[PDB]
Amino acid sequence: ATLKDQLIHNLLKEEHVPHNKITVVGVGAVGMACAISILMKELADEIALVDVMEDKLKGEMMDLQHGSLFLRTPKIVSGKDYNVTANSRLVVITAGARQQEGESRLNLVQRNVNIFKFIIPNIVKYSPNCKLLVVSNPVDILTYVAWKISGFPKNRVIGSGCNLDSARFRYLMGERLGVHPLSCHGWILGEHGDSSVPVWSGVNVAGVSLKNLHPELGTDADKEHWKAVHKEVVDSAYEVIKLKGYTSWAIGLSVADLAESIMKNLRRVHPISTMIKGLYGIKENVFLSVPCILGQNGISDVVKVTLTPEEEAHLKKSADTLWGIQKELQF
Amino acid sequence: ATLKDQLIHNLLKEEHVPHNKITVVGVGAVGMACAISILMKELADEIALVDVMEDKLKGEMMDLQHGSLFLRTPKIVSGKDYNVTANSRLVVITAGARQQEGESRLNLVQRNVNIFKFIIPNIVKYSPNCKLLVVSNPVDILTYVAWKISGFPKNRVIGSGCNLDSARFRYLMGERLGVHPLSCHGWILGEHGDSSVPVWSGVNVAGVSLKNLHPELGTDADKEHWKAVHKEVVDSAYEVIKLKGYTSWAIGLSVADLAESIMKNLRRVHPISTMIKGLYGIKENVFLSVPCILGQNGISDVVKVTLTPEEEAHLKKSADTLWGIQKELQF
Amino acid sequence: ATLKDQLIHNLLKEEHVPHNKITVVGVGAVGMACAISILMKELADEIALVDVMEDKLKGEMMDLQHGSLFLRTPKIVSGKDYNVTANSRLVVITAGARQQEGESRLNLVQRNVNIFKFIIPNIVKYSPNCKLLVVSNPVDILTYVAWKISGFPKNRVIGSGCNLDSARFRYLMGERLGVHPLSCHGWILGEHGDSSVPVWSGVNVAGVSLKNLHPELGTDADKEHWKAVHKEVVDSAYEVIKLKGYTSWAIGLSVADLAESIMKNLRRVHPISTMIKGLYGIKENVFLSVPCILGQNGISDVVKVTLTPEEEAHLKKSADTLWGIQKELQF
Amino acid sequence: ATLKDQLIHNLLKEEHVPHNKITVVGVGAVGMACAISILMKELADEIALVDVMEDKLKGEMMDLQHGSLFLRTPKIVSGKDYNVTANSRLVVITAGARQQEGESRLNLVQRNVNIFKFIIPNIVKYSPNCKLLVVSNPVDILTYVAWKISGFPKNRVIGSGCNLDSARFRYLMGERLGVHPLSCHGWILGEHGDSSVPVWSGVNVAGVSLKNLHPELGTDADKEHWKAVHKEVVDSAYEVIKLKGYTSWAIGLSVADLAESIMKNLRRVHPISTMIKGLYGIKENVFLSVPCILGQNGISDVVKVTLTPEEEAHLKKSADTLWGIQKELQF
Numbered sequence A, B, C, D: 001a002t003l004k005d006q007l008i009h010n011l012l013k014e015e016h017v018p019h020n021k022i023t024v025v026g027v028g029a030v031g032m033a034c035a036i037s038i039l040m041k042e043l044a045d046e047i048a049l050v051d052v053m054e055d056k057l058k059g060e061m062m063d064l065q066h067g068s069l070f071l072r073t074p075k076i077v078s079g080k081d082y083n084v085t086a087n088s089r090l091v092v093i094t095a096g097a098r099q100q101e102g103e104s105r106l107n108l109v110q111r112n113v114n115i116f117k118f119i120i121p122n123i124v125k126y127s128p129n130c131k132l133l134v135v136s137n138p139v140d141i142l143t144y145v146a147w148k149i150s151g152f153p154k155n156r157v158i159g160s161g162c163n164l165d166s167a168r169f170r171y172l173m174g175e176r177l178g179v180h181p182l183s184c185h186g187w188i189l190g191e192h193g194d195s196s197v198p199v200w201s202g203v204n205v206a207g208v209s210l211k212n213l214h215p216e217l218g219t220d221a222d223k224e225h226w227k228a229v230h231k232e233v234v235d236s237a238y239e240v241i242k243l244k245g246y247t248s249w250a251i252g253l254s255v256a257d258l259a260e261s262i263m264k265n266l267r268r269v270h271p272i273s274t275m276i277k278g279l280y281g282i283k284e285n286v287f288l289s290v291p292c293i294l295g296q297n298g299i300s301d302v303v304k305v306t307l308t309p310e311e312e313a314h315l316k317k318s319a320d321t322l323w324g325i326q327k328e329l330q331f
């Protein structure tokens, strides 16, 4: 005579198992900005939230659940134990120490590598066949780290990389040209950093190379100072940090973007961190942003951008800087 | 000739006037939740952000702008000034103090009225025809204050109210019954706070009244404790505040749902805060949530819900509770 | 070296297996409406189209494929064969004869059963675990046929039923009351046809029962003729058939709503066709619409709606009406 | 004592006036494919349908209304008199004679020009400040026609033009390259026809010019026959017509695309028909596809694509052919 029993006549029972489960490791500024964006885009049927902060974790879980009416993701779960993560199609890693005002993203390495040595083995134990998407900084070094510990194939380990950088770039060009960013094409390659390479030779609006119309555009001295657009891209992260303390909405939106190409298998081209040994005459084990076709299996192919010798100059530059650091690890 | 003049041939200038402009006043946890939710629902063609904290403001703006590629709201602007808010269809006010742990929303009244005394005349002046959506707590009292200061007809001054408490109610009912919140119907009327009323006479799943199946349901001391679901609703804000410090995701979702009915002129019914003088024997000018039909002109109608004598009793004590605080008229 | 080999560096092959694959059987007016609605809701990652008319089929496929840039379903395929339908989560059957002007849906039974006798075993063989969504008329009887032929548990054989009649009901109620269909609640149970039942005991706006306010509502010969709203529901198919020849947009929308609850495992309640033996004194194996809770496994539960003696009477005569045609067992 | 009056307490009344109204002239294959696509994308709050076929018109109106529950466009109206069209932000023209198997789209001119002389003056009388979007064939000639009769500024008269052609192109390249169409960039310029110009010099994946890697690509004799991709683009319309009788879904989706850039004012670049006198050394009053930045005011700017002398050769070719026809009109 329970209310439920007078009202509902049961046929079937509690299968469980989700088809499109997404996990978000770390429920901080970035982790919740990723979660909100991924929920609004309706990509998962089950989202799993993991943090070591128990109170915060349960608190953000509840705030998202409270919003159930308005969502189309009926199972929202969280925990400290990784069992909650089981059979995730995608695992977004956002956990770690973030930059303090004026901090070099390369200073976070000690602290974040200790976090990864801990969580990678726990996430791979429960989801042996997931696509890892690393957001934590320094993202290029940390993607290598996940790869190295997890033992996964180079296709299932992605670093958010220069998706955000190129998104800032398009936005900045778009404001100069008076065209929506969607319509200005421009790649920010290499390190998700201070040593990122603007590929000037590829910047265009509706198939027209801005470099043929303006050969002065790019890595020099004279102009309408297009070169300062690349500079505001390198600086934008710092200025936002100085103004609000951290960055979050642009990264959350750029994660939902990659998350959509993985979940729907669209095979779209995105500048993301991948293993580049055997490609720009880079002979080491580095991870850096290159245009990659992203799908349900992760990175299935890399696009061999036609780089000028100056641009290929800065890519072995960005790439060496980066490996300098990496051998000091080795664990 | 600029690179701009070489690439693009101009055909017009013109007055870029916004058609679906939304203003968010206060760029805090609640304001940005509102903002992101409204941007992902693609309700606005221009969003304006106003805050007194100049840096925070610029910061949130740039973070949002860098995500431009991923949104469909081409213009995002901000200022301390209010000239930026001109010709807004709707303005969402989230400015002010929030609860500290264990604090009643009624306790913020004096500080928030002090801020509304400044903001309302600057809003009313630049968007003579906007709809005001009041989020700041205690929401019922600030909605009356907003009304009073503004000089606006009642139809155009809306408190976010029990939209959110109703969502939380439906979620909790949902859990117990094994059905999505969307198929569980139930209303939380009165104060958006401790004195809210569960309308158990009306809780249904597919037209069937749970109070008809289980006459002991709710405001009954008997057997399966449905009454504890209302206590959880009441307590839910306090409980997320104790765990993460503030609530934000649920209300940003609830506001974008409201925002949707208003911008698209949907004529949906939402439990929101409005002037209930005349209805339910209410002789005082108090604001509280009652089911309202929401459209391009704000509140066009109020639904006369048929309250059991015990639910009417409880609604009255709720407006009695709000008027007690309301005789303070510090404006 | 191809231009392909020069542009792109490959990292993998792999088995492109679909995760959210939808099959639409029959590429007519109803099948393409279903198809477009399901593609715009971005429910599938692969859609397969099967029809016997080879040319029409190729045609609809190419039209759809040319719109690829505007959709997020990367793979669209078709064939006469059924090998193309493998590992589908859901299959929407819209194949068969439709009504000529003035024709009862019960009249198509013999022709459509002849087609189901061929299609069902070819479906059941290649997607052992799909959910069957039956659209072909008379929908109630073909759902039973589909069930019977298939060997599938009842939970996985769904008729589109009164989902659509309920939508039409809510629309009409909507008009009269001045509120969006979304805020008007009401159910059309029984046969998806002339014998359907309006459940006036349950029609509400915000929890308030219209039958409580106006006791003469509906299955009453008295004053404002709410009963004429049900007559319009019954008649609506006949009337659009006389004016444009067939109905298509409403049912494609109604099917994509259903499709949504199933793919995302929403657990929403929809009036759909299922086996009602045991409920409401129904001693025969007939299919008809009753409020059902819909999820990744199909029908997991049936809601026991509390019918007035006159509504129970009318539901019985509706299953009595369907069983009369049902003793024909030509399969 | 009406039901409505016991239930609803009125505050406000029937304002009317819509903010985002869209009109669709012609409710045939294309007109309803435009309407469905525009409704699913939620761009209008009011849609107006106009046709001379009264029965068909009312029948499609009803089928769309029946689907109200599932939509977010609460006013759906139709008529034979243009008063229904009043104060439309956008008017989509789809009315006219369509191609029979093997018919040259230039043969429809007599029949469609008689239709336009009739409807243009009626649509401009009710919406003096609308953006006209012409879809009817031959679209280039007919856009000129609307321009000429309406007396509108060249910015508010757009022809759907080569949006569809370039959408087919990307789709075809995308299948060769194994990349989503979204990611392969390629412009089909000129006549929405048989004399359309593929701009090979602008085709790229992630900023890399396929022509620098493969100089043989394009307008010649040797290869991997990329030139046949342009040919299937020219032929695709005919083959779809031969297979299903007409084309509709790809055009409907491409109209919703432009409709979104106009309604939301995104300022996106699209290949659409516009007045090109004073641009490729074309000295006449022709309309042909060029990359244009599209917004709330229509075409605000044109992008001066860098064309090879061969490509500029075929653009004055396409453009002359086209004006040959046009002087025979003059009305």
Ligand SMILES: NC(=O)c1ccc[n+]([C@@H]2O[C@H](COP(=O)([O-])OP(=O)(O)OC[C@H]3O[C@@H](n4cnc5c(N)ncnc54)[C@H](O)[C@@H]3O)[C@@H](O)[C@H]2O)c1
Binding pocket: A025, A026, A027, A028, A029, A030, A031, A050, A051, A052, A053, A094, A095, A096, A097, A098, A099, A108, A115, A118, A119, A135, A136, A137, A138, A139, A160, A161, A164, A192, A246, A247, A248, A251
């Ligand atoms: N790649 C990009 O473009 C990008 C952009 C912005 C920020 N980031 C990075 O994201 C990271 C997080 O920044 P943020 O603002 O959200 O930080 P935050 O302080 O707000 O949150 C970090 C979260 O990590 C958690 N954490 C620590 N150890 C953990 C463990 N074992 N498991 C789970 N969680 C653990 C914390 O408890 C905290 O909740 C930083 O490394 C930052 O640089 C990357």
Ligand SMILES: NC(=O)c1ccc[n+]([C@@H]2O[C@H](COP(=O)([O-])OP(=O)(O)OC[C@H]3O[C@@H](n4cnc5c(N)ncnc54)[C@H](O)[C@@H]3O)[C@@H](O)[C@H]2O)c1
Binding pocket: B025, B026, B027, B028, B029, B030, B031, B050, B051, B052, B053, B056, B094, B095, B096, B097, B098, B099, B108, B115, B118, B119, B134, B135, B136, B137, B139, B160, B161, B164, B192, B246, B247, B248, B251
């Ligand atoms: N109604 C609801 O259901 C509900 C739900 C949650 C929170 N809230 C209320 O939301 C309000 C905002 O909450 P919060 O977390 O975002 O606070 P917060 O401190 O994060 O941000 C409040 C913001 O208000 C701005 N502000 C203050 N005075 C201002 C003024 N005169 N002009 C402009 N901006 C001004 C601040 O500078 C700050 O950025 C609080 O009153 C809170 O209680 C209501």
Ligand SMILES: NC(=O)c1ccc[n+]([C@@H]2O[C@H](COP(=O)([O-])OP(=O)(O)OC[C@H]3O[C@@H](n4cnc5c(N)ncnc54)[C@H](O)[C@@H]3O)[C@@H](O)[C@H]2O)c1
Binding pocket: C025, C026, C027, C028, C029, C030, C031, C050, C051, C052, C053, C056, C094, C095, C096, C097, C098, C099, C108, C115, C118, C119, C134, C135, C136, C137, C139, C160, C161, C164, C192, C246, C247, C248, C251
């Ligand atoms: N349940 C509802 O509410 C509802 C609503 C509308 C229409 N319908 C029903 O939808 C069905 C389809 O309607 P319609 O307008 O699209 O018809 P239609 O003639 O437009 O298309 C029917 C299609 O079925 C295909 N077909 C027939 N036999 C086949 C077989 N063995 N295998 C494969 N395909 C086969 C045809 O070749 C044709 O393309 C009819 O039975 C109609 O009554 C039901």
Ligand SMILES: NC(=O)c1ccc[n+]([C@@H]2O[C@H](COP(=O)([O-])OP(=O)(O)OC[C@H]3O[C@@H](n4cnc5c(N)ncnc54)[C@H](O)[C@@H]3O)[C@@H](O)[C@H]2O)c1
Binding pocket: D025, D026, D027, D028, D029, D030, D031, D050, D051, D052, D053, D094, D095, D096, D097, D098, D099, D108, D115, D118, D119, D135, D136, D137, D138, D139, D160, D161, D164, D192, D246, D247, D248, D251
């Ligand atoms: N530009 C493109 O890429 C493109 C692509 C496909 C089709 N088209 C064109 O669209 C047009 C329509 O094709 P379709 O399949 O929908 O045709 P259809 O036969 O299905 O419909 C044409 C509609 O026009 C109507 N009509 C005739 N005179 C009218 C008047 N004064 N006012 C209103 N409506 C009137 C008809 O009654 C009919 O309903 C054709 O000219 C065709 O070439 C353009």
